[PDB]
Structure 1
């Protein structure tokens, strides 16, 4: 089931790092919408947020890179 619909969020925040962390895997890759149960509308938003975080070094691009 989708977590964002129950909460009814207007927009997924890239600054909300912890929440994002639940939607990325051990290697830092974005978890598919099939696994998470997220709705497609929110999924893209989430992805965007993740990307933004990656750009701003809040989340890593990959688990390896140092």
Structure 2
């Protein structure tokens, strides 16, 4: 529970802020569900977009296998 974004007044998630996204991706590299993390839906969508942009910029891995 405890969506960690609303309590901190987060307006937009930053794809550059890797460590936060590292908290919300699993070991294999897939996105952890909002039902697990307790994140609110709007921030969940923002988080998904940011993680995909980070994957594109090679700051996070698509999967564990390639590297």
TM-score, normalising length from structure 1?
Answer: 0.97
Paired with 1:65 and 1:30, the residues of 2 have a C-alpha distance of 17
**C-alpha displacement of 1:50:** 0.1
Q: Deviations over 1:7-62 (max 9, x none)?
A: 11110000000000000000000000000000001000000000000000000000
Provide the secondary structure at the position in 1 that maps to 2:16.
coil
User: How many pairs does the alignment contain?
Assistant: 66
Stretches of structure 2 that go unaligned for 5 or more consecutive residues are: none
Divergent runs of 4+, >2 A: none
Paired with 1:7 and 1:63, the residues of 2 have a C-alpha distance of 31
Paired with 2:54 and 2:35, the residues of 1 have a C-alpha distance of 22
Stretches of structure 1 that go unaligned for 5 or more consecutive residues are: none
CA-based RMSD of the aligned residues comes to 0.6
